[PDB]
Amino acid sequence: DSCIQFTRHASDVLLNLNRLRSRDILTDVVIVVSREQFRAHKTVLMACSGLFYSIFTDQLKCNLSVINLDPEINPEGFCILLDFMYTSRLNLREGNIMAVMATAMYLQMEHVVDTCRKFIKASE
Amino acid sequence: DSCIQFTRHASDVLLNLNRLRSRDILTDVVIVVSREQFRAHKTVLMACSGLFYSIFTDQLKCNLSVINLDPEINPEGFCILLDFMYTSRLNLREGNIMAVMATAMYLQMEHVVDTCRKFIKASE
C-alpha cells in the first residue's frame, strides 16, 4: 500500500497495556501458579505465548476467569515472563535463568527459550 | 535494572493482536459509526485513543458491548484509524485526509492529528 507508519506506535501501545495492567483495568483472567495469583489480559497472554493462544482459542477454556498452571512452574519465573510480555524487558539473572527457561518452554515463548539457551551455553 | 530487551517484541505483540481481530477472537465490543459496525478489543482501543480510554475507565460504560459514535463521524475515517491502531500504518490520502483528521481529533489520537496537520500545511 501507500501507508505511512508511526515507528513508536507498537511500543506506546504496549506501554499503555502495561499501565492498564498496573491499575487493574479490564484484566479478565487470574493465572494461578501454586500459592500466587497474577491478573492479566487474555489477549496479551495469547499474543505472547503459544500455550495461552491454545487455551483461549479453546471453546470451553476461553470462558474461564481462572487458569491453574502445572505445580512444577515457579511463580518467580512466571512473574519475570509476565513482566516481559508487557514490557519487552527480561530480568534474566544467574539465580533465575533455569526457572525462566523452564517456564518459557512450558508457555511456548520461543524467543525467550532461545536467549536462555545462548546465556547458558556461554557459561559452560 | 539489569534487563535485556527484545527489540521486535512490541511489533510482534501488535501483529498478533491484529490477527486475533481478523479472526474475531476475544473481541469484546462493537463500535457503531452510523450504518457500519466494527468489532475490536476494548484494551487496544483504550491504549490508542484518549476518547476510548475515558469511555472504558467509566464505571458504567466499561460494561457496554456496543458504543455508538457521534453521527458526524465518517465510517471510512474510523476504519482507517482502527487499522492504524492495530498495525501502526496509516492509509492517508488526499481524498480521506480531512475525514481522518476530524476522526482523530474526536478519538483524541494526538500523533495522527499531528501528521494530518503537517500534510495539510504542505498542500497550502
Binding site: 501507508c3 505511512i4 507508519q5 508511526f6 | 501528521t115
Partner: peptide
C-alpha cells in the same frame, strides 16, 4: 512517521 516514516515510509515503511
Amino acid at each position: 512517521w516514516v515510509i515503511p
